[PDB]
Amino acid sequence: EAPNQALLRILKETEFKKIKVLGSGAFGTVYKGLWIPEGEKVKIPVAIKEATSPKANKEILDEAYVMASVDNPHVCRLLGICLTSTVQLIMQLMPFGCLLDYVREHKDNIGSQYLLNWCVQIAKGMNYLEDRRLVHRDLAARNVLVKTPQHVKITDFGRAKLLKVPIKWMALESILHRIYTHQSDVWSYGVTVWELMTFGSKPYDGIPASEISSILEKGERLPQPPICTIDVYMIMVKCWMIDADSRPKFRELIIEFSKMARDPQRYLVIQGDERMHLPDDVVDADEYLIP
């Protein structure tokens, strides 16, 4: 493996200012805040993530390790960490919150252009993790954040690894045998897409997670969302193949979704599409990538 020359920056508690709480409870306490580097006329909006136990501090730092090691437009940036009694991860602020909440809150204002663009950006983001040899192991709409309606990024690398669990997003080989590859993340990409195309429905709603393993063994999959054409739904079903090597790679998903994003009303049928605003088989070179 190659040496990891990432800088982990250590920030002073004095350098930043907490303004209000965005999220709370189990996964942590996420605060809205502003960061002002010591000797620069610059104010950077940020999200700060904080009881102190030895086990808790290992896992929060392992997240910090990975987040510091990534640089992509569609992957979350760790700015630094502050070593107070409880450790704080200073990260880039994502004003519109998680995408799952965003789609549900704006069901009636999300056009097909946006949906397919998010599919490309997520696929792009995941493909970078594949390039960096990282498996995410928890891809969903709750762990994709919205910088702007035109710009989303992947997050939550507490479950990420090199080369309570969400059974309803996991591939079969992961559920049965604990085997996670990049192609097991493709399964979860498929579900994530399905969440967006259903405008934030719960996958396998009113089905307990212990039944899922046997359900998928029998051949059953998530149903085709109403807005989805057969073209888009086919791509989801390809992500949910029993054979993992049969599923598509993220580089190919980027291609297919970018293809569709050129002519969005052909591949998605939304009521009153492209009268709504928010705050030739051709692929542009930048969406054609080699590993």
Ligand SMILES: CC(C)(O)Cn1c(NC(=O)c2cc(F)cc(-c3cccnc3)c2)nc2ccccc21
């Ligand atoms: C629950 C959630 C995500 O909606 C909180 N939230 C956020 N989140 C972040 O800014 C944020 C940014 C990151 F770079 C990483 C994580 C992050 C998330 C999970 C685990 N680890 C790290 C969270 N922005 C908001 C704006 C409005 C309302 C709620 C908001």
